[PDB]
Amino acid sequence: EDPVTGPEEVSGQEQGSLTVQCRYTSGWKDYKKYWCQGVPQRSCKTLVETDASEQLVKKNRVSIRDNQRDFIFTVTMEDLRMSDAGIYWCGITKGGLDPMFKVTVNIGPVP
Ligand SMILES: C[N+](C)(C)CCOP(=O)(O)O
Ligand SMILES: [Ca+2]
């Protein structure tokens, strides 16, 4: 089974926000969750990472919060710019190889 599942594709508009939900299998409750940007995959930049609780982490234009009742972590990116498009990953931090799931972001420009 896949430890982490999100949307393969998500869309946002410049100046708006977008929200990505990554579900994870229940056993990964007590592991830190993260949202990572760019390529190559194992060298992506971690934008935000939880502390393995339900507490919100917000850094720069990005927030993440883990719902450990329903096993879904929610990422929001606000005040979107065209440079926010591209490849991202929902991830779980563990010793050794992290579970990761690729999300591709499309951004449309202001008229
Ligand atoms: C994916 N990462 C950039 C957050 C860390 C490196 O990946 P991994 O070796 O822990 O799987
Ligand atoms: Ca790791």
Curated annotation (Swiss-Prot):
Segments forming domain Ig-like V-type: 1-106
Subcellular location: Cell membrane
Disulfide bridge positions per record: 22-90, 36-44
Induction record: Up-regulated by interleukin-4/IL-4.
Region of interest (Plays an important role in murine norovirus (MNV) binding), residue spans: 20-26
Post-translational modification summary for this protein: Phosphorylated on tyrosine.
Summary of the tissues where the protein is detected: Expressed in myeloid cells. Present on the surface of macrophages (at protein level). Highly expressed by alveolar, splenic macrophages and bone marrow-derived dendritic cells. Expression is increased following aeroallergen challenge in macrophages, mast cells, and eosinophils.
Ranges of the Extracellular topological domain: 1-111
Highest rank taxon of the organism: Eukaryota
Family listed: Belongs to the CD300 family.
Subunit structure: Interacts with PTPN6/SHP-1 in a tyrosine phosphorylation dependent manner. Interacts with IL4R.
Function noted in UniProt: Acts as an inhibitory receptor for myeloid cells and mast cells. Positively regulates the phagocytosis of apoptotic cells (efferocytosis) via phosphatidylserine (PS) recognition; recognizes and binds PS as a ligand which is expressed on the surface of apoptotic cells. Plays an important role in the maintenance of immune homeostasis, by promoting macrophage-mediated efferocytosis and by inhibiting dendritic cell-mediated efferocytosis. Negatively regulates Fc epsilon receptor-dependent mast cell activation and allergic responses via binding to ceramide which acts as a ligand.
The protein's name: CMRF35-like molecule 1
Organism of origin: Mus musculus (Mouse)
Taxonomic lineage from the root: Eukaryota, Metazoa, Chordata, Craniata, Vertebrata
Stretch of the intact protein here: 20 to 130 of 337
